[PDB]
């Protein structure tokens, strides 16, 4: 699993606060920012993301939003960049005010395997 | 004997307070601004010198004039300015859902609306009052 992150730093945003909102969900991300504010990120550990989804009891929405964003061997979801500043995950649309576009690239593992690892059925009996 | 200028917008968590305020003041340099604990911005301005200058130096009076009209309600005119472009004092009229904008409501107390229009956004290079 490779984690690709995309979003923007608008003229009125702080670079520090956007990099931290991103890191609050994906701590090991390396970010590059273009002259025009484009944010290109790459992460790997799903630990924190999984930890938060469970602590906030939102696996129901997570499991669903993952299915919806599944296209091929890639899964694209959108997280509210603002709520992420306080390490809180909110799934939103692509037109939000902008969001953190996260694109999971599945190398070997099958999709089904990915769904139950991130957002398994009930808060129960989960793969690791 | 006045034009009341009311500024409204917000400062979201990932936004910088300094940048938002300067963006507002790039358009209205003498803005009196207060920020609620939730990030709601409330400002009050008076001079329209900077606003007229920029609409002219940027050659945008046709869009300005039409938008002033499209946003009239009687004695209150409401327009929406792109907050991002205002950071470099570039005036861009937008909608209410811009990814927030600067809501600017002009309160025309004892100055006729028709006269306000020709003062901020006159017709094709025509007569200009002071």
UniProtKB/Swiss-Prot annotation, chain B:
Q: Which UniProt keywords apply?
A: ATP-binding, Nucleotide-binding
Q: Where is this region: UPF0201?
A: 1-130
Q: Does the keyword Nucleotide-binding apply?
A: yes
Q: Which GO MF terms does the UniProt record name?
A: ATP binding
Q: Does the keyword Iron apply?
A: no
What is the top-level taxon of the source organism? Archaea
Which parts of the chain span the membrane according to its record? none
Q: Which family does it belong to?
A: In the N-terminal section; belongs to the UPF0200 family.
Q: What is this protein called?
A: UPF0200/UPF0201 protein AF_1395
């Amino acid at each position: 699993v490779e984690i690709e992150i995309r979003t923007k730093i608008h003229p009125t945003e702080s670079e520090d606060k956007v990099l931290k909102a991103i890191r609050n969900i994906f701590p090991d991300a390396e970010i590059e920012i273009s002259e025009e504010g484009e944010v290109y990120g790459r992460a790997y550990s799903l630990d924190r993301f999984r930890e938060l989804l469970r602590k906030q009891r939102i696996l129901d929405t997570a499991r669903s939003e993952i299915l919806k964003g599944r296209n091929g061997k890639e899964v694209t979801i959108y997280l509210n960049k603002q709520t992420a500043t306080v390490s809180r995950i909110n799934f939103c649309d692509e037109n939000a005010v902008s969001p953190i576009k996260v694109t999971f690239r599945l190398n070997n593992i099958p999709f089904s395997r990915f769904l139950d690892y991130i957002a398994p059925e009930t808060k129960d009996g989960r793969p690791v």
